[PDB]
A paper describes a structure:
The marine bacterium Salegentibacter sp. Hel_I_6 (Bacteroidota) isolated from seawater off Helgoland island (North Sea) contains an α-mannan inducible gene cluster with a GH76 family endo-α-1,6-mannanase (ShGH76). On overall, ShGH76 exhibited endo-α-1,6-mannanase activity with a preference for linear α-1,6-mannans. The tertiary structures of all three ShGH76 variants indicated a single-domain protein with a classical (α/α)6-barrel fold, with six α-helices forming a core that is surrounded by another six α-helices. Multiple sequence alignment identified the aspartates D136 and D137 as catalytic residues in ShGH76.
We solved the crystal structures of ShGH76WT (apo-form), ShGH76Asn (with Man3) and ShGH76Ala (with Man4) at 2.0 Å, 1.47 Å and 1.9 Å resolution, respectively. The ShGH76WT protein formed crystals belonging to the I 121 space group (Hermann-Mauguin notation) with three chains in an asymmetric unit (ASU), whereas the mutant protein ShGH76Ala crystallized in the P22121 space group with one chain in an ASU, and the mutant ShGH76Asn crystallized in the P1211 space group with one chain in an ASU. In the apo-form, in total twelve α-helices and six β-strands were present, whereas five β-strands were present in both substrate-bound mutant forms. The atomic models of the monomers of all three ShGH76 variants showed continuous peptide chains containing residues Asp54-Glu391. The ShGH76WT active site pocket is predominantly negatively charged - a trait that seems conserved based on surface electrostatic potential analyses with ConSurf. Besides negatively charged amino acids, the ShGH76 active site features seven aromatic amino acids (Trp90, Phe134, Trp140, Trp182, Phe256, Tyr258, Phe313). Superimposition of bound Man5 from BcGH76 suggests that Man5 does not fit the cavity of ShGH76WT due to a steric clash of the Trp254 of ShGH76WT. The terminal mannose of the Man3 and Man4 ligands adopted a kinked conformation so as to occupy the active site, which has not been shown in GH76 structures. Superimposition of ShGH76WT with ShGH76Ala and ShGH76Asn resulted in variations of 0.23 Å and 0.21 r.m.s.d, respectively, indicating minor loop movements on the protein surface but no global structural change as well as intact active site cores upon ligand binding.
Numbering used by the authors: 54 to 391
The structure:
């Protein structure tokens, strides 16, 4: 069953990438480089496993990871990459909602304060990409920020957190979202004195976090406009276009790009579980997840359980942790859809 596929990928990922301090190394060829936001998504994958199985063995692995991230980041959680902080904050609030472990909440609160400090009037709003790159406002430092704020609002029910979610999402939609397709451009930045939007870089995980934010805003407010937003973006993901090759989410390389597919699948799946989704869209989205899962399972996984950047070809060399996490995420999402 899909659950057993996901469990096997979980075990393989853990054993191949485990390294010092309960964190996870950059690749399977001995590169020990610490990648903060990849390890945040490893936390996300471990939570996926815990939620599926209820197996208590996930909990020490999660906790060690949380603490190891702090150590390998220089004995602090703050990072000059603001998107990094947002991703870890999301994982921490997910875990808090599931375990009530206050250590995760305290980390998330620190990171939320860091995140808000990244907002500025450059380009009319939005959270900066990095604390030393204030003039770049990126989909990956805003979509996740809106999700982070929505999890915080769901938990502490402080209205200022929903205010923040709405502010962030409104700026994102106005600036970086194509009004017709709902695809999401990577960033707006100043280059040689002038403001440029990179429309060439349409990445899976940016439309993914836009969908995720839209879906959570729908759940936080009830307003159908958010669900319509989510549906338009997701429908453009399913239909043939820039993000698919033969009905399969495209190869976006390794390194950071290796993780992009998995993040889209995560939030795509959360949309498909939205109770107010029309039945036809639900069936279509579930089918899309199944088709990608089948394709990776039969054509992309090496015998040892490693997924490559192209879910249709087995990798023959280095596999970065990010790439592998995307495969694990797809399988956990399929299992979640039963």
């Amino acid at each position: 069953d899909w659950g057993e596929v996901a469990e096997n990928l979980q075990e393989q990922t853990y054993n191949i990438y485990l390294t010092s301090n309960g964190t996870f190394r950059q690749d399977n060829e001995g590169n020990e480089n610490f990648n903060y936001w990849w390890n945040a998504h490893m936390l996300d994958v471990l939570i996926d496993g815990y939620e599926r199985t209820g197996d208590e063995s996930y909990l020490p692995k999660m906790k060690s990871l949380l603490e190891g991230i702090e150590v390998r980041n220089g004995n602090k959680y703050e990072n000059v990459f603001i998107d990094d902080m947002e991703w870890l904050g999301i994982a921490c609030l997910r875990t808090y909602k599931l375990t009530n472990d206050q250590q995760y909440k305290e980390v998330a609160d620190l990171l939320w304060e860091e995140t808000k400090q990244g907002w500025s009037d450059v380009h009319g709003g939005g959270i900066a990409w990095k604390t030393d790159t204030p003039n770049s406002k990126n989909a990956c430092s805003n979509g996740p920020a809106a999700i982070f704020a929505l999890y915080l609002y769901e938990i502490d029910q402080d209205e200022e957190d929903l205010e923040w979610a709405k502010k962030i999402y409104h700026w994102l939609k106005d600036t970086l979202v194509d009004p017709e397709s709902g695809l999401v451009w990577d960033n707006i930045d100043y280059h040689d004195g002038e403001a440029i939007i990179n429309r060439d870089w349409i990445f899976t995980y940016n439309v993914g976090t836009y969908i995720g934010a839209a879906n959570l805003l729908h759940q936080a407010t009830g307003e159908g406009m958010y669900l319509d937003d989510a549906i338009k973006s997701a429908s453009s993901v399913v239909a043939p276009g820039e993000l698919t090759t033969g009905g399969v989410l495209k190869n976006e390389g390794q390194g950071d790009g290796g993780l992009f597919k998995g993040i889209l699948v995560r939030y795509f799946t959360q949309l498909a579980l939205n109770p107010d989704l029309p039945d036809g869209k639900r069936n279509e989205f579930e089918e899309f997840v199944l088709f990608n899962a089948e394709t990776l399972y039969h054509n992309g996984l090496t015998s040892a359980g490693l997924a490559g950047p192209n879910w249709n070809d087995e990798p023959s060399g280095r596999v970065d942790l990010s790439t592998q996490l995307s495969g694990v995420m797809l399988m956990e999402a399929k299992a979640l859809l039963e």
